[PDB]
């Protein structure tokens, strides 16, 4: 399929395996893998993003019409997911983030209602503020961390 | 128009027009519906599905799908019919009534049956 | 019909059905905002039309003719609903003056 | 009946709607009159003043902004007018006075802004009796 | 005093009134809904017998 | 934005953004029409439309192709200009006045001349 070879997938699957969490048995080394795929014109049907989605564990989608918005690193938060997630994150922003996947994924349903009029109530506009205002705070500079 | 005659060519660009205006209007009646036009495309689309329901005829062959017996309608009756839809002779007909049909005067006599049926 | 053309407009036309779908539940809210309005009007205009009931007012014998539509459209069989009883209406009566309340 | 059927009617809400009543007092043209359980069938154009209704319960006491008051033949009163009007809140002097004098500057203009404002001028004296 | 004679119809009369009585409103309780009752924008173009017009007046 | 100066790095911000909601307020526009949007979705709508045919501009190569002699803007009045047109300060001045212009010089020259 689009002229790769057979074993495409046996060259992939070889390679992100190698990443790994080794036991106390060991000796606890890690590594941990991010590989990078360029897609063509916002598409996962191609044969190669197809093959790296059913071996790795989610998305960091990235996408450019988040871009031009100015939403800087343009993290598709709707797409993004990580089969992992919740299990291996800082336990002081796990207590806090909780709710704010909630938030987002509230206000991606609600976010065509904020270009009209003030014809709403607070039940949709107080959800409209608290998703302008934390997509607006994902906004940073490049080479910033935090 | 110099093979068929100027007015068998001018009424056939009417009717080219007149279909062509429909199939550009299609989107937008799929999406809102018809009342979303203007007042002389509403006319046209209007006119248009009269055509196109006037463009069916009875085959002599297919007589058993349709019950209806055959319909050999010469050339002149259909030049002056077309002429005559496209002039607006008979805008207020309803549309179901050009459908299936010969010529003109078929249109009006159905015209006719459905009026004594409907009442 | 190349695969790029059908993906734009599957697109453009999920783009139309979120913002068919949000225009729906505006109109939905300021038709309960207006329900109040017409209340309003209506339980207002029976105190001047039950006199109007009993007082018995019944006109005999150049009229003005004033309709009520929208200055925006997409609401569809109104405007040319009300536009045909103004016809209807005058037919009867051509040198009436008319006064429109809408664009 | 015994009693009368009141519908008190507002361009943006209707108070009252056929709830029973003893007395009612309206401004009208020919001076305040007071309209109980059986009237004669009368219409009576209504000058912005006071009306109050006094019921079994006590007398509620609104300011209004003129109107008509219509007795329906079956001793049904209706009154069909603009504005309600609290107890006493939602008018004050400063906003009264500070703004009455502009309009009697105003009314000294041409003709269409002095008509109003005359009119403005006679309905502020009107509510100099609600400041009482 | 000749309002009827000088200046405004009836219903505009009680118009005024009304605006006078928005106008004297205790500024704690002059709402958002009573400046929405006192929001005039329509505009009116008399129109002549020859389809003319004159410009949108501010009513 | 350390290369070029914040000045021009958010003027390139501000017009990435009003182009990116112009083309998706290209959706609702092209069925719903202008009667539907805001005052600031009707102002952005404006001043994209502005800021598109302000790229316009004619070429001395293609001075056969269009018949109007070659304007060639330096940086620094570019910078500027969209940062005039950002703000708003000539909301003014109708569209047509902007396409095939060089700064904004020529601009309010040609916004003059076409008042004719």
New interface residues.
């Given amino acids: 399929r689009e002229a790769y070879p057979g074993d495409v997938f046996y060259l992939h699957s070889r390679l992100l395996e190698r990443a790994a969490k080794l036991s106390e048995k060991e000796g606890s080394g890690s590594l941990t893998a991010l590989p990078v795929i360029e897609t063509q014109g916002g598409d996962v049907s191609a044969y190669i993003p197809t093959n790296v989605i059913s071996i790795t564990d989610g998305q960091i989608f990235l996408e450019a019409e988040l871009f031009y918005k100015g939403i800087r690193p343009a993290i598709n938060v709707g797409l993004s997911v990580s089969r992992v997630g919740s299990a291996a994150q800082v336990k002081a922003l796990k207590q806090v983030a909780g709710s704010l996947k909630l938030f987002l994924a509230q206000y991606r349903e609600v976010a065509a209602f904020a270009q009209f009029g003030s014809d709403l109530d607070a039940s949709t506009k107080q959800t409209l503020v608290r998703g302008e205002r934390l997509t607006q705070l994902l906004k940073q500079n490049q080479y910033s961390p935090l | 128009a110099a093979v068929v005659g100027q007015e068998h060519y001018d009424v056939a660009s009417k009717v080219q027009e007149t279909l062509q205006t429909y199939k550009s209007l299609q989107d937008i009646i799929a999406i809102l519906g018809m009342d979303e036009l203007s007042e002389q495309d509403k006319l046209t689309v209007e006119r248009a599905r009269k055509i196109q329901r006037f463009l069916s005829q009875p085959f002599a062959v297919a007589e058993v799908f349709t019950g209806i017996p055959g319909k050999l309608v010469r050339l002149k009756d259909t030049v002056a019919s077309f002429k005559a839809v496209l002039e607006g002779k008979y805008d207020n007909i309803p549309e179901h009534a050009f459908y299936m049909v010969g010529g003109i005067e078929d249109v009006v006599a159905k015209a006719e049956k459905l009026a004594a049926e409907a009442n | 019909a190349t695969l790029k053309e059908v993906e734009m407009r599957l697109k453009?036309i999920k783009?139309?059905e979120?913002?068919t779908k949000?225009?729906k539940?505006?109109a939905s809210?300021?038709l309960s905002?207006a329900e109040?309005?017409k209340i309003?009007?209506k339980?207002?205009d029976?105190?001047?039309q039950?006199?109007y009931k009993?007082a018995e007012t019944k006109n005999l014998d150049k009229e003005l003719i004033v309709a009520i539509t929208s200055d925006?459209?997409?609401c569809?069989?109104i405007?040319?609903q009300l536009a045909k009883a103004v016809r209807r209406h005058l037919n009867d009566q051509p040198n009436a003056d008319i006064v429109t309340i809408g664009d | 009946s015994s009693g009368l059927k009141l519908q008190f009617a507002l361009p943006h809400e209707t108070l009252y709607s056929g709830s029973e009543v003893t007395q009612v007092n309206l401004p009208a043209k020919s001076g305040r009159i007071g309209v109980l359980a059986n009237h004669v069938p009368t219409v009576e154009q209504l000058l912005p003043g006071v009306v109050e209704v006094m019921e079994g319960s006590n007398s509620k006491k609104f300011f209004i902004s003129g109107g008509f008051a219509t007795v329906q033949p079956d001793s049904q009163l209706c009154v069909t007018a603009i504005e309600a009007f609290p107890l006493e809140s939602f008018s004050q002097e400063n906003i009264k006075n500070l703004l009455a004098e502009a309009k009697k500057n105003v009314s000294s203009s041409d003709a269409r802004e002095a008509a109003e404002a005359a009119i403005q001028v006679e309905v502020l004296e009107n509510l100099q009796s609600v400041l009482k | 005093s000749a309002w009827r004679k000088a200046g405004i119809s009836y219903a505009a009369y009680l118009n005024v009134a009304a605006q006078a009585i928005r106008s004297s409103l205790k500024t704690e309780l002059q709402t958002a809904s009573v400046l929405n009752r006192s929001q005039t924008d329509a505009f009116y173009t008399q129109y002549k017998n020859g389809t003319a017009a004159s410009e949108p007046t501010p009513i």
């Fill in positions: 453009s783009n139309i979120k913002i949000t225009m539940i505006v809210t300021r905002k109040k309005a309003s009007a339980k207002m029976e105190a001047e039950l006199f009993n925006k459209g997409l569809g069989s405007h040319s």
